[PDB]
Scaffold this active site. Structure first.
Site, PDB file in Angstrom:
ATOM      1  N   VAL A 184      38.026 121.191 -17.658  1.00  0.00           N
ATOM      2  CA  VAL A 184      38.253 120.466 -18.950  1.00  0.00           C
ATOM      3  C   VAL A 184      38.821 121.498 -19.863  1.00  0.00           C
ATOM      4  O   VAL A 184      39.280 121.271 -20.923  1.00  0.00           O
ATOM      5  CB  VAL A 184      36.776 119.967 -19.508  1.00  0.00           C
ATOM      6  CG1 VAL A 184      36.663 118.679 -18.703  1.00  0.00           C
ATOM      7  CG2 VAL A 184      35.285 120.761 -19.544  1.00  0.00           C
ATOM      8  N   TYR A 226      20.668 126.028 -29.107  1.00  0.00           N
ATOM      9  CA  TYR A 226      20.350 124.388 -28.937  1.00  0.00           C
ATOM     10  C   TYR A 226      20.632 123.603 -30.188  1.00  0.00           C
ATOM     11  O   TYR A 226      21.124 122.755 -30.189  1.00  0.00           O
ATOM     12  CB  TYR A 226      18.805 124.303 -28.438  1.00  0.00           C
ATOM     13  CG  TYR A 226      18.315 122.785 -28.410  1.00  0.00           C
ATOM     14  CD1 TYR A 226      18.689 121.886 -27.428  1.00  0.00           C
ATOM     15  CD2 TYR A 226      17.719 122.189 -29.640  1.00  0.00           C
ATOM     16  CE1 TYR A 226      18.526 120.854 -27.519  1.00  0.00           C
ATOM     17  CE2 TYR A 226      17.413 120.890 -29.795  1.00  0.00           C
ATOM     18  CZ  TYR A 226      17.748 120.013 -28.422  1.00  0.00           C
ATOM     19  OH  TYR A 226      17.567 118.629 -28.395  1.00  0.00           O
ATOM     20  N   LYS A 251      23.676 121.065 -30.861  1.00  0.00           N
ATOM     21  CA  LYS A 251      23.523 119.588 -31.323  1.00  0.00           C
ATOM     22  C   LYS A 251      24.101 119.382 -32.437  1.00  0.00           C
ATOM     23  O   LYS A 251      24.458 118.303 -32.719  1.00  0.00           O
ATOM     24  CB  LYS A 251      21.798 119.489 -31.347  1.00  0.00           C
ATOM     25  CG  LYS A 251      21.337 118.158 -31.931  1.00  0.00           C
ATOM     26  CD  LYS A 251      20.225 118.119 -31.711  1.00  0.00           C
ATOM     27  CE  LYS A 251      19.103 117.176 -32.684  1.00  0.00           C
ATOM     28  NZ  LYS A 251      18.310 116.236 -31.946  1.00  0.00           N
TER      29      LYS A 251
END
Ligand SMILES: COc1cc(NC(=O)c2cccc3cccnc23)c(OC)cc1Cl
Ligand SMILES: COc1cc(NC(=O)c2cccc3cccnc23)c(OC)cc1Cl
Lengths: 237, 243, 229, 240
Positions: free
Chosen positions: D68, D147, D151
């Site tokens: 990707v 994290y 997010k």
């Protein structure tokens, strides 16, 4: 010379819960900035202590008894302030697990009750500052997150309602601040909490008060509906 | 006799303000100068740099105007070296420098430049065990296309500011942002008035903000009083919230 | 398959509430729909019948402890405990939010005993459809925070609590809005249309399933990409 | 002939990072819902494993190699899929790198640049069809900073892209997992495992299948009015 966008000279400020810690530090910061300050407590000893603390710091004002959960106490206190000193145009609300719902419900109902009572003076004057102080981090996580979400949403709504009158409404959301309640937490809990703060230390009460002092100034006139977190980088949701 | 031991002020602090040649940036440079900082304002052209120097002079602010391109590692490193040599390490840094498919490029570029400037200045702030990084969001700049771009830049800036705050907190360096709303600037002065009334009707204060009103918030976040504020984005929008 | 579950849906006599009652019934639930009047209750029973859904229409006022306790007792006696509860029933900006949250709490607390006994449950709160902005944002913020807090309180019991926050949905209120207001609103919606009531119902039907068992404290926006804060 | 009565009969779905855990569970859910599924991996052994897993489960589709981070590999893989099976109108991006591959920034920057690259390449097929589903999978739970950053980036990105492509009846959403039961997480010491559970109101780890169900729904016609959303699937554990 003047740092005039910071002067509160000529304003009367009402600070609820002013007998210790954060409330007290706010009362002094506003006094230092030139406000006349009325600090409140729920007992007569708290009121008297407030007056002494203000005196010792050269702050003109008063300590009085106020129960934010009572319409009668609120109305009476405001009358008494009007008679003796004038209308408070700066109001700082600092007076706060199957209780989680009732606690938030009760606190927002008291913010609303005090706010609505003070708005008439602020409307007449076409100027005002309402600043709501969240609770300090210290079951507990659920209550804390719920009270904080309620305060942010409430503050933004009320900001919207009264904004056309040049009245700003903001909040301050403290983190782990060094106070009476936090000094006596068990060490385990205090060390765990420190380990989650990027600044690696507890905040001082003065560091909340500074933020409040700014929001109450003319320099913060375009800030409204905001909740400013003062937590050393520790965000709990 | 040139010694000066300040307490609780910006006195003697050296402040770097990118994009200082007009509007918000200029108002910030003057506010920090009025608070006693030595101010280095930057622009991308030599005429901007020169205009900044003149503005500072006319206002009695000690400092300088320099050319800086925040998209270039070379320009950044060079500019920081020059500032070190001539004035000292900047411990206050303020980063201030058509359809709905431009959002990605714009935000990507701006965040990469915030990071690049920030990382370069952190060494000085680490050595000093003290610092202020303040990121300025973009003003609302148009219907939809404008709304998408604005919301995207704002969401990127909040998350980025919070993450950087976390990375450098242990060093007594704060990182915060300011998210303006509709501010009275060159772009907004020339909008059609028919539209201007629609805009005002979305703002509870019923007016546009002044550049000075953004500058005051930055002045406060740069002070010692804001020492426990970090990772925050302070909205300065007169109560108009768009996400 | 919600075969074997009893679902209570408040405000089920029209629009979003009705489409939810039918979606749950199509998924095999026994459905009790409520309304505040006897004609609403009767209409609900007829709608369910016409669609082959077993259940009932009843009168319920979510602002009254007495009405709540009585209705739940009646459901218990006649059909069993509702383990899927969908709350769709609903100076002034403050009183509105205060009243609605006090009702969500009141209904929720009353249904939790059945769900606790069963060690399984689904509570799903429906937000209101889009001065107006202030009210809407306030009700939405209150719902999100409330849903998350309750989720936390009951999670150990394998009860999920979630909300759905609709945007501009085609209903009775929105069908009669002046064109100016409808075209302004469409221009802010990336999908360029109103949502159907059935599109809120499908989200509810998914949250009520076993597949959503790890989703709790969430507010799912169903607004075609239009976000107001 | 055999026509599934499931939500995605007749659709072609591309799932990146399908060779284990969450990605694999998604590929099987979408296949169980009747889609033809192309699962991808970065190596030829991953691709081959994916083809075997799909076969063993009665899912029509294929395993392919896709990187990707490369415009060429993206364009090539999409073309091969078109030629041999049809245009993928459901695309699930689950091929996020982590700090393992200054870092907090580079990770998020890299992952958003790959989401954008894949998404832009698949949008032409979806535009022609006037229909599409793009679903971004966030990362599972220093660690807190990474994290929260991943997010926040994913949430803002998903909402912006949703805005850009909405007029075309294409939805763009994300799923934000919490603590999920995977290869890494089973082995944790008791002390650490009990501490973790105490922070999750449901009192357990999520299964990979529980993420896959949410993706399955967002891919359906029933989620047609859901766009720009990030759906958390975390058992009530919220960090930001
Ligand atoms: C965060 O969890 C809660 C939130 C609220 N209320 C609000 O968030 C709220 C948000 C905005 C306006 C309100 C007006 C009246 C009462 N509440 C609100 C609440 O209402 C008391 C109770 C709980 Cl447990
Ligand atoms: C939360 O921390 C971050 C966020 C982002 N990016 C965004 O938040 C973001 C948000 C919304 C649109 C974007 C478009 C291009 C790149 N980034 C974005 C980011 O961009 C690479 C880096 C970090 Cl550390």
């Amino acid at each position: 010379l003047y740092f005039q966008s910071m002067s509160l000279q000529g304003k009367v400020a009402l600070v609820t819960g002013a007998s210790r810690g954060i409330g007290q530090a706010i009362a002094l910061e506003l006094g230092r900035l030139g406000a006349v300050v009325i600090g409140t407590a729920t007992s007569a000893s708290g009121a008297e202590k407030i007056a002494e603390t203000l005196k010792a710091n050269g702050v003109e004002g008063a300590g009085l008894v106020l129960d934010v959960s009572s319409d009668e106490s609120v109305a009476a206190t405001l009358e008494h302030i009007q008679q003796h000193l004038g209308q408070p145009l700066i109001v700082v609300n600092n007076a706060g697990d199957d209780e989680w719902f009732d606690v938030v419900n009760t606190n927002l109902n008291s913010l609303y009750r005090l706010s609505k009572a003070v708005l008439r003076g602020m409307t007449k004057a076409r100027w005002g500052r309402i600043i709501n102080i969240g609770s300090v981090v210290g079951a507990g996580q659920t209550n804390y997150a719920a009270a904080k979400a309620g305060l942010e949403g409430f503050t933004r709504a009320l900001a919207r309602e009264v904004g056309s009158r040049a009245i700003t409404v903001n909040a301050v959301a403290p983190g782990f601040i060094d106070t009476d309640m936090t000094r006596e937490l068990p060490e385990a809990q205090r060390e765990a909490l420190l380990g989650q703060i990027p600044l690696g230390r507890l905040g001082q009460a003065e560091e909340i008060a500074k933020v409040v002092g700014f929001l109450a100034s003319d320099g913060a006139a375009y800030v409204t509906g905001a909740t400013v977190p003062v937590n050393g980088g520790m965000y709990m949701s």
